[PDB]
């Protein structure tokens, strides 16, 4: 599913991301924009053989099982395919564990390079939440 901007903001809010670990909704929406262009089916293969899945491009080296990342963990306890669903539950629940890991949203390199320190509220502007 490719989400609309406000449609994703709403879903993320409903799922408990607004100010989760202190990160306002706009941060999450910005991150999803640049990680996946709001497409739940997005995947990207990493040079190390790990793969990133879903709206927030969650990576198989630590967070999900895809059966093809040697030496990896599955800390969210889900198959990586769950991260590609139209239903964002699995991605949101897994994101909560990642953003709780110690580095905040710096775990998403695209957030740090493209959203951190920017006017992120602009991503939720004019949405009925
Ligand atoms: Cl994701
Ligand atoms: Cl694996
Ligand atoms: Cl933090
Ligand atoms: Cl940018
Ligand atoms: Na894994
Ligand atoms: Ru870690």
From Swiss-Prot:
SUPFAM superfamilies: Lysozyme-like (SSF53955). Residues 1-129 form the C-type lysozyme domain. InterPro entries: Glyco_hydro_22, Glyco_hydro_22_CS, Glyco_hydro_22_lys, Lysozyme-like_dom_sf. In the egg white and polymorphonuclear leukocytes. It catalyses: Hydrolysis of (1->4)-beta-linkages between N-acetylmuramic acid and N-acetyl-D-glucosamine residues in a peptidoglycan and between N-acetyl-D-glucosamine residues in chitodextrins. GO terms for molecular function: beta-N-acetylglucosaminidase activity; identical protein binding; lysozyme activity. GO terms for biological process: cell wall macromolecule catabolic process; defense response to bacterium; defense response to Gram-negative bacterium; defense response to Gram-positive bacterium; killing of cells of another organism. GO terms for cellular component: cytoplasm; endoplasmic reticulum; extracellular space. Its EC number is 3.2.1.17. It comes from the Eukaryota. It is found in: Secreted. The active site is at residues 35, 52. Its main location: secreted. It is an enzyme of class 3 (hydrolase). Lysozymes have primarily a bacteriolytic function; those in tissues and body fluids are associated with the monocyte-macrophage system and enhance the activity of immunoagents. Has bacteriolytic activity against M.luteus. Belongs to the glycosyl hydrolase 22 family. Monomer. This is Lysozyme C.
